[PDB]
Design a protein around this nucleic acid. Structure first.
Lengths: 78, 205, 76, 129, 121, 156
RNA sequence: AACAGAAUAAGCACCGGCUAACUUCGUGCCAGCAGCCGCGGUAAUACGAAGGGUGCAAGCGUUAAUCGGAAUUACUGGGCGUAAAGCGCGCGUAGGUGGUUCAGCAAGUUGGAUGUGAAAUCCCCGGGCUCAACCUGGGAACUGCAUCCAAAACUACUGAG
RNA sequence: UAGUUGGUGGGGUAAAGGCCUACCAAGGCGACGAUCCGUAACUGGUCUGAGAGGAUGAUCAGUCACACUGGAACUGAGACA
């Protein structure tokens, strides 16, 4: 299956996720089909937490992309 | 690592005032700045051509108190920016926080201003800064913390502001002790003894 | 996609051989050399001569080392 | 058996301005007769004449603002066997834009200041100061 | 050379080789010693230099040099050699680290002690 | 005028019979800080007297240099002997970066942005000739423009 | 946020020239030094010490290993009368280069469009960690290769002189 | 260099092919460096350089190749694990 899930970038104790669409049998930090947004939990000041783009998420979700548990709510809270 | 030791002795080799001792007592009375230090303080002659450029670089590096690992770091940010690396090298040494405390007049020496920053007594945007490397911007309201407004180190030093004047890119208020860094300096308030065309040429070869 | 070369061989059975010249430039000395190319175009009717000027195109492989075919004979 | 004609027109110009000649006469072509038009409009020679019938010539009159001549150096760039081609970005500039450089473009033989205005690259010929 | 020759035979850059052929790409090397000579230098000097010959763990049998002012180096004792080309003696291409394994440094020395391996009083 | 700058000092000799007679030579360039320079070479029998002789010949037979103002006009390349010299003007903040004997020419001329390099044989008494063929043959365009200015300067 | 108190916390190489920085004391062709020049034979600013001084600092030095400087494999950017370097002289195949007028063509060439050149890295403008390293948003770039459209000066090919 | 290089007929595999076989034919490649010897996993990139270039492929990422040595198939969507 293909799936929409979260990567992990940044230092220790300061994460920064990436909404990628990947084949399911890959690594976390490995290859991907494309990337559509990010998610910053520790965003402070001028930083933006959610930055999903609704165009490609309209495209992939109509072709059987299967989201994760956190991405079940982040697309919902837009 | 700072420099802890004698301080006339640095002014005594380069042969200038250099503004290192604190009070307005006297140059060349605490110091006896007539000669090169050491035993052979009488023999002289023919500073080498490489030795002239190192003598200019070591002069600018001892007014402000940097070390060479930091000083080459400022030299990289000079050559990054657009145009006139000599002027840009000075304006990154003017915007540093231990200089601006000295320009406002919250200390006698420049090394006194380093200690007032280091003991958390100085704020910048309403919040505490204890780093003697903080590059301030245009319009940062440097003020003094209320727990130490009664120190005589700050009160006495404002009578040592009389022999200095205002540098006309700051403004200081002698009641609340809250200076305001107005804008960047120009290349007219700096003395002509420093040379922006010997330090740039030293870091080529 | 369509190439052009000249025939050098008629020895095999239903199989012709072309020379495709090419001017590549040298990567560092800035000069256009000539370096050749020699294929095995699948002939179909055993009717080309040594010295022609023909035209080839690419198909699926027919034997091994023979994937190009013959479009048409241009000139003798 | 001369291999390149246009490096022979430039050689006679460089030599005649050391013998302090005035008129130079070499055989012509439909390219040499267009280069000398460009050197006249930029201004290095006086004039030029295509005056014969079956061996058409090219008679060039040279300038001397001083005892030193007006052309001080000239070299051929696209020598036959190198064939130097340049686009508009990598097109050279001689002496900070004080010499001339002659570039054969899609719109005729013109100088470097003209084709860079039109945005057409091409083939360099020479770098006259 | 013209361009049409360099296409046919391009410019091949000549190569060097290591002045330290033993201890193949490594900064130090240990070995056990065999003989402690005391040889004489070349012509414009006059001295009596002290030279030990070492068999490494590579199997090579190369001469070496011992610095300092006095060495306890009896035979069959391990050392730790390093590079360094002595101009005076012929065939000597290796120094010997003091204070590392067996040579144990020097004594009563107060200038440049990280060289020759001396402590701090 | 007079701003002096020394480059070279030697110890030449001369064998006669008996012993060997020594002598000192010196090379000293003199400029005005605006674009009027002049070099000089003197030989005498001691250091404080050979420098004075070379200074006097410098301020005779001088050169007027038409600088653009702390820079040059265009990249040029001149040569003398087995010594080749390249120079091209630079930006504002960059000082003079050249080797030994082209700094002393390019200080006293008043230029500040020179960005030079010398090839071939480095001879300090002979790289100066390679520099002064370059500077004394500048143009300083007396034209109506530059991108247009090839109808009134070529007639100059 | 509060309490203690200046208390809890500085070495390392070098100083004859390249090369910033120097004089006394031992030693006397001995011991020893060394990146190259080279010092030491009884007054050593070069060996061993002592004062002094200069460079760097929580690090400083040596060794090993690449690229620079090296226009010292030179495309950009060198040479061959005597310094190293023109075959003993011819003829000639593959190959390289082509006098002069038109005409055609568009393979080179120039301009443009589309598809591509993974993300990171480098660069530019910003944004977060008390600053910086670090993390991160947007752009340029990735010099390429391919498919189309146009131009025709020069080279190629073709036709005529 | 003799399944070697093509042709034809038949097999074989998810799929084109000397992949395999039976006869036919005597071809194929090579100084634009085949063949053989010696070494080495390649790439996006890192390190120097003004630039052109020169070395080099640790950590991070993509691809390949192995799982004590040499073979071999089964199971299965997909392994010669």
């Amino acid at each position: 299956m293909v799936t929409i899930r979260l990567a992990r970038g940044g230092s220790k104790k300061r994460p920064f996720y990436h909404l990628t669409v990947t084949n399911s049998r890959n690594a976390r930090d490995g290859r991907f089909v494309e990337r559509i947004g990010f998610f910053n939990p520790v965003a402070t000041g001028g930083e933006v937490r959610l930055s999903v783009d609704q165009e490609r998420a309209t495209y992939w979700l109509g072709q059987g992309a299967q989201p994760s548990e956190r991405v079940a709510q982040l697309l919902k809270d837009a | 690592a700072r420099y802890i030791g004698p301080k006339c002795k640095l002014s005594r080799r380069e042969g200038t005032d250099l503004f290192l001792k604190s009070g307005a007592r006297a140059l060349d009375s605490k110091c006896k700045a007539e000669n090169v230090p050491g035993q052979h303080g009488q023999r002289r002659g023919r500073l080498s051509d490489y030795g002239l450029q190192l003598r200019e670089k070591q002069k600018v590096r001892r007014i402000y108190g940097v070390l060479e690992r930091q000083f080459r770091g400022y030299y990289q940010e000079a050559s990054r920016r657009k145009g006139s690396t000599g002027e840009n090298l000075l304006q990154l040494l003017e915007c540093r926080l231990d200089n601006v405390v000295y320009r406002m007049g919250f200390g006698s020496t420049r090394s006194e201003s380093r200690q007032l920053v280091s003991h958390k007594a100085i704020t910048v945007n309403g919040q505490t800064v204890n780093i003697p490397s903080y590059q301030v911007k245009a319009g940062d309201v440097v003020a003094v913390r209320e727990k130490s407004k009664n120190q005589l180190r700050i009160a006495q030093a404002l009578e040592l502001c009389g022999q200095r004047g205002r540098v006309e890119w700051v403004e200081v208020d002698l009641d609340k002790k809250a200076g305001t860094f107005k804008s960047a300096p120009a290349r007219s308030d700096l003395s002509a003894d420093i040379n922006e065309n010997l330090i740039v040429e030293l870091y080529s070869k | 996609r369509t190439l052009t070369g000249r025939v050098v061989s008629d020895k095999m059975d239903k199989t012709v051989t072309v020379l495709i010249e090419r001017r590549v430039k040298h990567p560092i000395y800035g000069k256009y050399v000539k370096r050749s190319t020699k294929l095995h175009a699948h002939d179909e009717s055993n009717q080309c001569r040594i010295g022609d000027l023909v035209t080839i195109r690419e198909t699926r492989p027919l034997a091994k080392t023979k994937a190009w075919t013959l479009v048409d004979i241009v000139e003798r | 058996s001369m291999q390149d004609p246009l490096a022979d027109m430039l050689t006679r110009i460089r030599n005649a301005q050391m013998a302090e000649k005035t008129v130079v006469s070499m055989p012509s072509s439909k390219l040499k007769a267009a280069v000398a038009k460009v050197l006249k409009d930029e201004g290095y020679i006086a004039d030029f004449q295509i005056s014969s019938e079956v061996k058409p010539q090219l008679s060039i009159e040279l300038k001397y603002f001083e005892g030193k001549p007006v052309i001080e150096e000239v070299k051929r760039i696209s020598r036959p066997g190198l064939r130097q081609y340049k686009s508009v970005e990598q097109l050279p500039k001689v002496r900070g834009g004080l010499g001339v450089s002659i570039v054969s473009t899609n719109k005729g033989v013109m100088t470097d200041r003209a084709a860079r205005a039109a945005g057409v690259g091409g083939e360099v010929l020479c770098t006259v100061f | 050379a013209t361009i049409n020759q360099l296409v046919r035979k391009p410019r091949k850059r000549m190569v060097d080789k290591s002045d330290v052929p033993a201890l193949q790409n490594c900064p130090q090397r240990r070995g056990v010693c065999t003989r402690v000579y005391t040889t004489t230098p070349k012509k414009p000097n006059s001295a009596l230099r002290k030279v030990c010959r070492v068999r490494l763990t590579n199997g090579f049998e190369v001469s070496s040099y011992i610095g300092g002012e006095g060495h306890n180096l009896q035979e069959h004792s391990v050392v730790l050699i390093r590079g360094g080309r002595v101009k005076d003696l012929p065939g000597v291409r290796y120094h010997t680290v003091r204070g590392s394994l067996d040579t144990s440094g020097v004594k009563d020395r107060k200038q440049g002690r990280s060289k020759y391996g001396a402590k701090r009083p | 005028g007079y701003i002096e700058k020394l480059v070279q000092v030697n110890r030449v000799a001369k064998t006669v019979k008996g012993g060997r007679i020594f002598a000192f030579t010196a090379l000293t360039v003199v400029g005005d800080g605006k674009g009027r320079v002049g070099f000089g070479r003197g030989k005498a029998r001691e250091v404080p007297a050979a420098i004075q002789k070379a200074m006097e010949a410098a301020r005779r037979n001088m050169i007027q240099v038409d600088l653009n103002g702390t820079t040059l006009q265009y990249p040029t390349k001149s040569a003398h002997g087995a010594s080749k010299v390249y120079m091209q003007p630079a930006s504002e903040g960059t000082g003079i970066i050249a080797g030994g004997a082209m700094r002393a020419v390019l200080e006293v001329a008043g230029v500040q942005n020179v960005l030079a390099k010398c090839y071939g044989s480095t001879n300090p008494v002979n790289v100066v000739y390679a520099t002064f063929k370059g500077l004394k043959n500048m143009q300083a365009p007396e034209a109506v423009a530059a991108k247009r200015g090839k109808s009134v300067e070529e007639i100059l």
